[model samples]
Target: KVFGRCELAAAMKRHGLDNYRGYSLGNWVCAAKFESNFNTQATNRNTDGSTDYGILQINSRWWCNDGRTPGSRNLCNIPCSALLSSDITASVNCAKKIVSDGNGMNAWVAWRNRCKGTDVQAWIRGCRL
Candidate 1:
């Protein structure tokens, strides 16, 4: 399912992503905006041969199992397929573990390049979540 910006914000918030780690909720919203454009099933492959899956684009190399990536570790103990659903609970759960490892929100290059140093709060201004 493709989520609207406001809808995504509400979901992320409801799932407890707001201020998880030091990152503001808007950072998450901005990252997902640039990462997967709110599409729950979005996927992308990296040059390193691992694929990024789902809304947050959780990587197969370290976070989820695609069963095809060389040297991949299911650090989040989830199948890549789990990320492709509209439920988002699994995606949010894996992300919490990822950030809890102290990487914060820098796990996604999309977040670093597009969300970092930007006025992320503007991404959720009218959302009111």
Candidate 2:
């Protein structure tokens, strides 16, 4: 499912992405814009065989188990495919875990490249949530 900007913001806020791990809601919204464009089932593949999945793009290398990913850790304790659900719960839960590792949001290149150090509120400009 592809979410509108405000819709995604509200949904993300529901999952506690608002200032999660010291990052603002805009950071999350903006990161999602660049990473998955608010698409719930987005997927990206790496040359090494690891795949990034879903809105927050929890990856197969360390956060999820895609059996195809060698050395898979499944740290989020979920099948990589679980991240593709339109429900967003799995991806949101996994995303929180990703930031908590003290790696900050570095796990997502989109965040660093597009959201870091930027006042990203404009990403959700029309959203009241």
Candidate 3:
């Protein structure tokens, strides 16, 4: 089951999530739902038959292949996933940094559009995080 607001908020706090929790939770949940149905151990098969692994559906192409750290070949190198196993903020922050050139949300918007066929900008409007 998806986490309720209070549970999500507490998890955010424990993970040092300092941003507004309102829309972020939705974003996280959305990403999780789209990526892995919220399964931490989820893995997927790529078109070439390579493995994409972990929560947030991180692919091995983005980072090194190590099980931990950004330089590792494993998708676990994704910074956010490495930070907190259950916090969405980590994935969000990682995505934000990867597209820090004012394209964070724009890139996310693209992903959302492709995934849900709807503009997600309005969904996160006024979101502090």
- Per-candidate clashes, comma-separated: 0, 0, 10
Superposition error at 89 for model 1 (Å): 0.6
Instruction: Give the residue spans of candidate 3 off by over 4 A.
Output: 1-23, 66-96, 99-111, 114-129
Tens digit of lDDT per residue, candidate 1, span 21-51? 8888899889888899999999999899999
For model 2, residues 2-103, the per-residue Cα lDDT tens digits are 988899899999988999888888998898889999888899999888999988888899999988998989899999889988788888898999899988
Of candidate 1, the 10-residue stretch with the lowest lDDT total is 99-108
Model 3 C-alpha lDDT per residue in residues 1-129, reported as the tens digit of each score: 344444543454455433433334445445545566555556665564344444455555453243433333432344323533554554545444544444443344324654444553443345444
Candidate 1, residue 108: Cα displacement in angstroms equals 1.1
Q: In lDDT terms, which candidate is top?
A: 1
Instruction: Give the TM-scores of the predictions, in the order they appear.
Output: 0.95, 0.95, 0.48
| Model 1, CA-based lDDT | 0.91
lDDT of 3 at 99: 42
Q: List the global CA lDDT of all models.
A: 0.91, 0.88, 0.46
TM-score of model 3 vs. true structure? 0.48
lDDT, candidate 2, residue 11? 91
Error of 2 at 24 (Å): 0.9
